[PDB]
C-alpha cells in the first residue's frame, strides 16, 4: 500500500462500479495513490462522485472531460495544473463504437461509424497525452487498455478491433515521442471479464466458458488482476518499461 504513495493519477472512463476504470482506481488507491476522476457526461457526474466518495482519505477531485471536445479537454488539465500541480500518470479507459458495427460483417461498416470509433477509442489517447505532458513534470506513465481483437480477428469485434489496432500503434508512436520527456506509455490487453451475474445460456457466457476451458490459467480475467498490473506500470518498478502491451488474459494470447 506504499508502491504509489505520494503519487497522483488521473483516472478516465469511470461510468459505474462495474467500469474497468473503477477496478483500476480501487487498485491504485490501495497502493497509496491519490486519484483524480473525470466524467464524460454530466449524466455520469453523479456516479463518479459517489464512487469517488467511497474512498476514505482525502477528497478526490472530480472534473468534466469530454475527450471529443478539444476545449473541454484543455480546460480539464488546465484545472489540474491550477489546483493539483504535478500528476504522475493517466489511466485512459475510454472506448466506443456504434453497437450495430459490432454485428455483421466488418465490410459493411459505415464511414461515420469507423471515424467515430477511431476518434473516441484511438485518437483520444493522443489528445489526452498532449495535455498530460504539461502536468507530468516528474515523468511517469500513461496507461491505456486494449484487447486481443486489436492484434487478431475476434468474432463480432469488427470496427473496435481496427480502433484498438490504431490505439496500439499510437501507444508505440507516443512512447517514442514522450520517452525523452521522462514519460512512459503502455497498454494492458485484458482478457474478457465476467461482469454480469447470469450464467448458463448466452453468447458472452460461451466466450467465458471457452476461456476457462482453454486458457493456460484455466480461468477468466478479473478487474483486480488488471488493476494490479496497472499498479506495476504506474510504479517506479516499471521505470524501464515503455511501448509495451502486457497481456492480462490468463495466457489466452499465446494459443494457436
Amino acid at each position: 500500500m506504499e508502491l504509489l504513495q505520494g503519487k497522483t493519477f488521473v483516472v478516465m472512463g469511470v461510468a459505474n462500479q462495474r467500469s474497468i476504470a473503477w477496478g483500476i482506481a480501487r487498485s491504485l488507491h490501495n497502493a497509496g495513490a491519490k486519484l483524480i476522476f473525470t466524467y464524460a457526461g454530466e449524466r455520469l457526474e453523479r456516479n463518479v462522485r459517489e464512487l469517488a466518495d467511497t474512498l476514505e482519505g482525502q477528497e478526490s477531485l472530480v472534473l468534466p472531460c469530454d475527450v471529443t471536445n478539444d476545449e473541454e479537454l484543455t480546460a480539464c488539465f488546465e484545472t489540474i495544473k491550477q489546483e493539483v500541480g504535478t500528476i504522475h500518470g493517466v489511466a485512459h479507459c475510454i472506448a466506443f463504437a456504434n453497437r450495430d458495427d459490432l454485428k455483421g460483417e466488418f465490410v459493411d461498416t459505415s464511414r461515420d461509424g469507423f471515424l467515430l470509433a477511431q476518434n473516441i477509442s484511438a485518437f483520444s489517447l493522443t489528445a489526452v497525452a498532449r495535455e498530460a505532458k504539461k502536468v507530468m513534470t516528474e515523468g511517469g506513465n500513461i496507461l491505456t487498455l486494449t484487447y486481443l481483437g486489436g492484434e487478431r480477428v475476434v468474432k463480432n469485434y469488427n470496427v473496435m478491433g481496427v480502433a484498438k489496432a490504431s490505439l496500439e500503434a499510437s501507444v508505440k508512436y507516443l512512447a517514442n515521442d514522450l520517452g525523452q520527456h521522462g514519460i512512459r506509455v503502455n497498454a494492458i490487453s485484458a482478457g474478457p471479464i465476467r461482469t454480469l451475474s447470469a450464467k448458463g445460456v448466452g453468447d458472452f457466457n460461451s466466450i467465458l466458458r471457452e476461456i476457462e476451458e482453454r486458457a493456460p490459467l484455466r480461468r477468466t480475467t478479473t478487474q483486480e488482476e488488471v488493476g494490479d498490473t496497472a499498479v506495476f506500470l504506474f510504479s517506479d518498478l516499471a521505470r524501464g518499461v515503455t511501448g509495451e502491451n502486457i497481456h492480462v488474459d490468463s495466457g489466452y494470447h499465446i494459443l494457436g
Copy 2:
C-alpha cells in the same frame, strides 16, 4: 506471361511514373492482365490517362473514384460492372496525411489530421472492398500496400504509421469477412524505393539483400497474390523490403 491471362484488375493510386501503383500495373500487364485505372481530380486524371495510354493492347478504362466520396465510389464500380462485367481484384495504393503531421512529435497531431489520414489511408480499403465484392463474380484478391512503420516506429512516419496499423488490421477483418465469398485480402509491405538518401544508404548497408526495393519487385509480388498460385493465402502481409523487417 499468361499467369493473369484474361483477368481484369482495378489499380488505384497511380499518380506518376514513380508510383508503386504504376509498378504494379506494369507487372500485371506483363502477366497478361487487363487493367482499369482510377483517378481523383484533374491532375491525377491527366497523368493516369497518359500512363494508361502507354500500355500495349486495348485502351485501358480510366474512371473517377474519390474514395472519400461514397456516391462517386459506388458509381465507379457500377460503371465497371456495366462495362466489363467482372473483375478479379483490386490493387489499393491510396495513402495520404498532412505533410505538417509527418514532422513533429506524433503527440502534436491534430484531430482533423488524424481522422483525415484514417479516412483516406485506412477506411478506403473497406469502402472499396464493399463495392468491389459486387463485381468480383468469381472471387479473387484485394491487395493493399503498407510499410514497416505500421508495425514498428519509423522516424517521422507518425500519423501515417497509425493509419497503416489500422489498414493492416482492416486487412485481417476483411479477410475474415470475404473469404467465404472466395475473396482473399492481402498486404505488401514495401521498403523505401530510390526514385532520405541516408535512409536509403542505411538500407543498402544493413538489409539482408544489401539493396533497396524496386517498383518492379513489389509489382511481381502483386502478380503472385492476384494469381491462382496464391489461392491459399489470405490475411497475409508480405514484406518486399530486401529483408529489412527481420533486423533488430
Copy 3:
C-alpha cells in the same frame, strides 16, 4: 509453365505421395523445373525413386542425404556439383520428433528427445544451407516448411513447436547471412491437410478459417513456386502462411 524454366531444385523430405514435399515437387515440375531428390535409409529410397519415376521429363537424380550426418551431407552436394554444376535452391521439408513427446505435457520432454528434434528439424536447415550455397552459383532461394505451432501454442505439438520456433529464427539469421551472396531464405507455414481427433481439428478449420476449407499440398506447392521464382527476388526472411487464413484468428 515457364516460371522456373531451366532451373534445378533439390527437394528434401519426400516420404510418400501425401508428403508436402511431393506437392512442392509436382508444382516445381509443372513450372518447368528439374528436380533432385534426397532420401535417408532404405524405405525412403524406394518411395522417392518410385515417385520421381512418375515425373515425365528426364530421369530425376536421387541421392542419399542423411542430415544428421556431416560427411554424407557434404558428399551429397559434392555429387550434385559434379553432376549438374548449379542448382537454384533447396526445398527443406525435414521434421521429426519422438512420438511419445507429442502427447502429454511438454514439460516432460526428455533431454534426448528435445535435442533430437532440434537437430533434425531445426539445425538441419543450417547444415543444408552451408552446403547448398557452394552449388548455388547464381543465387536463388532456400525454402523451409513450418507450422503455426512454432509461433503460438498448438495442442500436443509440444517439442515440435519449440523446434519450429528454432527453425523460424534460423530462417531469419540465415537470410541475414546469405542475402549478400544473392541467396534468399524463406518459410511457408502450412495449415493442416486432409490426407480420429484429427478430423475435429480439420472440421474446426473448415468452419472458422477465413477461406472455410483446409489446405492442400498443391496450394503449398504453388506458393513454393513463387518463392523459388524471380517474382520473389525482393522477398527474404519471410514466413508466408498458406493456411486458409487461420493464422489471423484470435
Copy 4:
C-alpha cells in the same frame, strides 16, 4: 519492502556480483523475499556463498546445480523439498554459447555448438520447470531472461538468437502445461546493460551509445530495472500474467 514477504525463490545463474541473476536477487531480497542460490561449477561455489552472505537477516541455502546434469538437478530440488519444502518461484538466468559461434556467419555454426547452446540456454528451462513443479505446491512464477535477438536478427548474436527463440517458445508451451497447476511462466527481454567501466571506443560501447541515442527512454537498461520487473512477475500483482515476454529495454523493441 513487503511485496514478496513470506515467499521463497530459487535463483539460478549467479557467477559474480556483476551477474544479472545477482541484480535480480538483490531486488527480490529488498521486496521481502527469501532466497536459495544454485551454483553451476564448484568454481563459482565460493562466489555465490560470499555473495549470499551480503544479504543479511536470513541464511541463504546454497546448492550445487548443473542443469546439464539430470541427476544433480533432480538431487538439487529434492534437497530444497527436504529442507525448505515449498518455494514460490524460480529465476532462470542461464545461457551459454561457444564464443566463436558469436562471430562470423551463422551459416558456419557447428552442429555441436548449436546443440550445446540449445541444451544449456533453452532446454534447461524445461528441465528446471519439471523439478520445480514438485515443490511449487501453492503455484507461483517461473521467470527466464531473453533478448531481442531471439525475435529479430542482432549482429553477431547468431546461435544465441536461435537458442533464445527456442527459449521463448518453451516459455509459451510451459505456460500452457503448467498454468493448470497454478504456475505461471514468463520471460523478461532485457536490453543491453553497461557492466564494464571502460567508455569511449569499443563495439559494445557503440551498441550502448546507439541505444542511448535512439531508444525511446534515451538510456540503457540497468540490472535494477530488470530486477524490479522480476519482483512484479513473482508477486501476486502479476497473477493474471503468463506466457508473456516483458521488454525491459527502454522501449528499444518498438523501433523500426
